[PDB]
């Protein structure tokens, strides 16, 4: 069922962005992992208490004695001890255990004795190095004190039955062979190098992405799951199923390289595996990028969900299976029986681990924000061209250049009426309106000429009902009702007064003859002749070729009789509704909320753990800004979706004689991407700030931070005095601090 569609010349941005993030998060992770495993390579050669271990009972011990202790327990693993010293259990001599063994459980079953008799095997009795209490008291003061033999073994609590072999094999490789969370649990003296775990992980990620991409669009004729019935919402029968099917298929290719890194110190294939994996990653990215370009917008979300389910299957039920089967194999086949400066090194390792586990969260957040912003960054050019075409076709300059109030009738006579109705410009989507405001405060003409530019005669607004011409009730309510403003959608931000969605409105007709008849009827019956603050002509538009709307608003307001202040605005937007399912904006608006909650809980935890006086500290303010911005971005988009759905329903209810004023949706849709475009700015700035970790490039940020107070002081002084190219003080102020920090960095 393999097909060769190539049906479009467009590009899908979701797949490209996902692959780019999944590759950058591997490059940076590999750099950090190399900088970390250098330590393991150079080091491969306090629960344990350094209590008095003076040995005076083991006699007749002339041989090379080696001790191996494994402190098995909750997140603890140990090894042998270096027998280097003056005697170090030499001929007819004893020794004590004193090494750097940080992994050791507490008062739990942590006992394992391995005695190696290199050379001779002299019979002696050395019980143990008893420990009572120094820091954590990992054990007690007791020992079986077995005799000396040829590589004897001893086990204790706080080859035999399977109950010990299986447990030992499981615990040894439970988080060692689980390659996902194995980067943080590399066993010392292992040749798997911790830098080729990150290669297999990214290989699995890109293979999942490639398989899911090739399944969607190419193999879609045997199940017909292509758009029309492939509901992007989780059916739990075709998304997770495809994820599992894609996950199982990759392993026969993944396992052929994972087994090749291990057991390869088997001659030199370790470097060949790297090249093979980097070729597979490249081909898997290329095929996805070429195939997904034909994805309709409604299937990329399904692809993302399927890939996420695929990864989660290879993490909670496929890798534990592999370690369990491998442990059962080793416990059933071959009967294997063998499974002051240091503080600064521990601190460095902890810092590197924190960096490593924060980088992934930052990259996930960056991916979510990028999909929220540029997930639909293909309607931007179309929107710009659509607004430009509407403005040049509607003669904008010929409109707002009018200066007197009766040019409006010729204006609607020659350009507006041919535009609204006719064999051309068919997509209209609703008749126009002429909702005008009154001001109730008819004003005499102002002194002609240069004005004070300040709005004058600011009075009240008329609200009562009137009749044809003006106020003349005969029996009941008037025929020119006020049409009270709607709750949602208003506030055009007038030149000298904020308006709303209320005012006396006309319908402008539906055909040429009736439209012109109505225009004449209202013109010769004193409609726009009185005070007549503003007119507010605004209709709509729709564009089916691209799938975009536009809210058109033409404002003509008269602060003073005689002067015509005109303005216009075309706001293109895409009408996407909340009832459309699980569209991408709904997916990334319920994901940013999770990140906002995570940041809020991880920051409010500090105040109950650090107390007060955290104010005035920049870290306690630049983090509460991120929570507010993320919540605002996630909430404005949801409000826009709800508003669009409500407006569309209200429209379809009464289309032939309704207007429905889609401008509120156009404003909310502008704000939503005005907010999600600033959060990405903060993320990029933080990415720039995180460049300080290179040794020789760490001075720029420090110089800027140190010299910022003086620059602000100088700017404040200049402001108080009330340009810069002549007496350049920024250059010298930065130069002095740069020299000082370079000096303090060079010689020490």
């Amino acid at each position: 069922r393999f097909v060769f569609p190539e049906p479009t010349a467009d590009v899908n941005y979701i797949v490209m962005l996902t692959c780019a993030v999944c590759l950058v998060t591997y490059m940076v992770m590999a750099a950090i992992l190399h900088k970390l495993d250098q330590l393991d390579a150079s080091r491969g050669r306090r629960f344990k208490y350094e209590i008095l271990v003076k040995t005076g009972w083991g006699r007749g011990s002339g041989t090379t004695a080696h001790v191996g202790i494994m402190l098995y327990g909750v997140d603890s693993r140990s090894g042998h001890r270096h027998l280097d010293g003056d005697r170090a259990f030499h001929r007819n001599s004893l020794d004590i255990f004193r090494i750097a063994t940080p992994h050791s459980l507490g008062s739990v079953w942590k006992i394992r004795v391995w005695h190696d008799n290199k050379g001779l095997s002299p019979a002696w009795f050395l019980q143990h190095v008893i420990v009572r209490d120094l820091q954590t008291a990992r054990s007690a003061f007791f020992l079986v004190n077995d005799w000396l033999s040829v590589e004897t073994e001893a086990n204790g609590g706080l080859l035999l039955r399977f109950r010990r072999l299986l447990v030992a094999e499981l615990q040894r490789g439970f988080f060692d062979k689980h390659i996902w969370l194995s980067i943080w649990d590399r066993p010392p003296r292992s040749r798997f190098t911790r830098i080729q775990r990150a290669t297999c992980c990214v290989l699995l990620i890109c293979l999942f992405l490639g398989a899911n991409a090739v399944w969607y669009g190419a193999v879609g004729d045997s199940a017909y799951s292509t758009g029309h019935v492939s509901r992007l919402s989780p059916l739990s029968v075709d998304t997770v199923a495809v994820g599992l099917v894609s996950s199982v298929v990759v392993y026969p290719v993944y396992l052929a390289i994972l087994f090749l890194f291990r057991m390869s110190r088997p001659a030199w294939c370790a470097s060949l595996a790297h090249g093979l994996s980097l070729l597979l990653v490249a081909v898997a990215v290329a095929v996805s990028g070429w195939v997904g370009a034909s994805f309709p917008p409604g299937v990329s979300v399904a692809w993302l969900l399927s890939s996420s389910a695929s990864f989660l299957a290879s993490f909670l039920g496929w890798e534990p299976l592999k370690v369990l089967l491998e442990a059962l194999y080793f416990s059933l086949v071959a009967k294997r029986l063998h499974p002051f400066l240091a503080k600064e090194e521990a601190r460095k390792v902890k810092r590197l681990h924190g960096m490593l586990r924060s980088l992934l969260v930052y990259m996930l957040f960056l991916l979510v924000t990028l999909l929220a912003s540029y997930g639909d960054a293909s309607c931007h050019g179309h929107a710009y061209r659509l607004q430009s075409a509407i403005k040049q076709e509607l003669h904008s300059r010929a409109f707002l250049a009018i200066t007197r109030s009766e040019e409006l009738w010729p204006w609607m006579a020659h350009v507006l009426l041919p535009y609204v109705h006719g064999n051309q410009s068919s997509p209209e989507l609703g008749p126009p309106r002429l909702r005008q405001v009154r001001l109730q405060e008819a004003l005499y003409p102002d002194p002609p000429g240069p004005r004070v530019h300040t709005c004058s005669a600011a009075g009240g607004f008329s609200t009562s009902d009137y009749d044809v011409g003006w106020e003349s009730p005969h029996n009941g309510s008037g025929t020119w009702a006020y049409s009270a403003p709607d709750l949602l959608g208003a506030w055009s931000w007038g030149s000298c007064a904020v308006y709303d969605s209320g005012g006396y409105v006309q319908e402008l007709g539906l055909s040429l003859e009736e439209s012109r008849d109505r225009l004449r009827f209202l013109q010769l019956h004193n409609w726009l002749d009185n005070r007549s603050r503003a007119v507010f002509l605004e209709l709509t538009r729709y564009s089916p070729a691209v799938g975009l709307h536009a809210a058109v608003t033409l404002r003509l307001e008269f602060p003073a009789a005689g002067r015509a202040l005109a303005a216009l605005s075309v706001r293109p937007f895409a009408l996407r509704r909340l009832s459309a399912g699980l569209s991408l904006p709904l997916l990334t608006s319920v994901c940013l909320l999770l990140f906002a909650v995570h940041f809020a809980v991880a920051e409010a935890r500090t105040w109950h753990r650090e107390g007060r006086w955290r104010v005035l500290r920049l870290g306690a303010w630049a983090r509460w800004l991120l929570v507010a911005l993320t919540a605002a971005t996630a909430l404005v988009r949801l409000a826009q979706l709800g508003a669009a759905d409500r407006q569309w329903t209200r429209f379809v209810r009464g289309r032939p004689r309704r207007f429905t004023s889609f401008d509120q949706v156009a404003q909310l849709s502008s704000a939503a991407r005005g907010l999600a475009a600033s959060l990405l700015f903060l993320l990029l700035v933080k990415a720039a700030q995180q460049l300080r970790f290179v040794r020789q490039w760490s001075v720029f940020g420090k110089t800027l931070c140190r010299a910022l107070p003086e620059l602000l002081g100088v700017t404040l002084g200049l402001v108080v005095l009330g340009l810069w190219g002549a007496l350049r003080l920024g250059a010298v102020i930065l130069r002095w601090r740069y020299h000082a920090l370079r000096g303090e960095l060079y010689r020490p």
Binding site: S373, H380, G381, H382, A383, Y384, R385, L386, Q387, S388, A389, I390, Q392, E393, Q424, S425, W493, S543, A545, V546, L548, V570, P572, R673, G674, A676, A677, S678, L680, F681, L684, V685, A687, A688, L691, V694, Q696, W697, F700, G701, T703, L704, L708, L711, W724, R728, G730, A731, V732, L734, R735, Y738, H739, R742
Partner: protein
């Protein structure tokens, strides 16, 4: 009708007074959202080149240029296997390869565009039909671009041979020693630059025209740095984020992050002069 998407007009002229053709193309394209976008192109070709003595002189110059490129190819490949290999941390041997490659590409393009001239003879046989010269006018443009870039790089290569005294060696060393620091700071500069560019593109990129595309945002920001464009049109695009973007961009990219280049260059020059002066103070 409404279904048309583009419309082209093509013709050409000769002007026998100076032997120089000129092909003309006029394009108006009607997007699917309405409107018309006109465009034009005038290209003065020359297809009967071998007419005068100066043409023969120029042909001889091209032959000499080809011989020089062959000589440079052999004298650069002599310093690969006979001598040091992977000596690419020099920037003066990573620039000769660029010149040689561009010159070879230019020679190939010229041979291709002058070896397929059958359109002129075909038209000259029957002179009542449309002369199809639209292909030659494309290769002429490509040849012009390649030749211009090659000339620029050949002129840049002159810096290798100006070290005749101390006052020039000092400047060359000052330029060479601050290249790494400048490269280190340029990344941090351009990350924030691109962040501003994308913010402008997403916010204003629909109603301003100057930020209509990403490239336009980049060029507009460069012109802001030059102090060319003013914010008279940004403000009405967005009342709230109009002035904030302009003032904050100017503040943080005109005398805070723009002065670091000056600081680095001044400090490095002072250090280099001090070191070479102290080196002489022991004779």
């Amino acid at each position: 009708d409404r279904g048309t998407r583009a419309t082209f007009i093509d013709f050409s002229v000769y002007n026998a007074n100076i032997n120089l053709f000129c092909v003309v193309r006029l394009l108006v394209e009607f997007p699917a959202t309405g409107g018309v976008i006109p465009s034009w192109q005038f290209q003065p070709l020359k297809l009967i080149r071998y007419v005068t003595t100066f043409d023969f002189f120029l042909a001889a110059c091209e032959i000499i240029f080809c011989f020089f490129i062959f000589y440079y190819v052999v004298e650069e490949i002599l310093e690969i296997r006979i001598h040091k290999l992977h000596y690419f941390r020099s920037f003066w041997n990573c620039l000769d390869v660029v010149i040689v490659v561009l010159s070879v590409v230019a020679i190939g393009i010229n041979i291709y565009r002058t070896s397929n001239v059958e359109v002129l003879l075909q038209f000259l046989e029957d002179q009542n039909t449309f002369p199809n010269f639209e292909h030659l006018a494309y290769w002429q443009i490509q040849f012009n671009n390649i030749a211009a870039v090659t000339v620029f790089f050949v002129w840049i290569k002159l810096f290798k041979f100006i070290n005749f005294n101390r006052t020039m060696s000092q400047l060359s060393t000052t330029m060479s020693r601050c290249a790494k620091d400048l490269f280190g700071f340029a990344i941090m500069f351009f990350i924030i630059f691109l962040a501003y560019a994308q913010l402008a593109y997403l916010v204003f990129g629909t109603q301003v025209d100057d930020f209509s595309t990403f490239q336009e945002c980049i060029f507009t920001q460069f012109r802001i740095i030059l102090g060319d464009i003013n914010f008279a049109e940004i403000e009405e695009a967005n009342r709230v984020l109009g002035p904030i973007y302009f003032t904050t961009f100017v503040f943080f990219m005109f005398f805070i992050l723009l002065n670091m280049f000056l600081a680095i260059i001044n400090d490095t020059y002072s250090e280099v002069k001090s070191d070479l002066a102290q080196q002489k103070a022991e004779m």
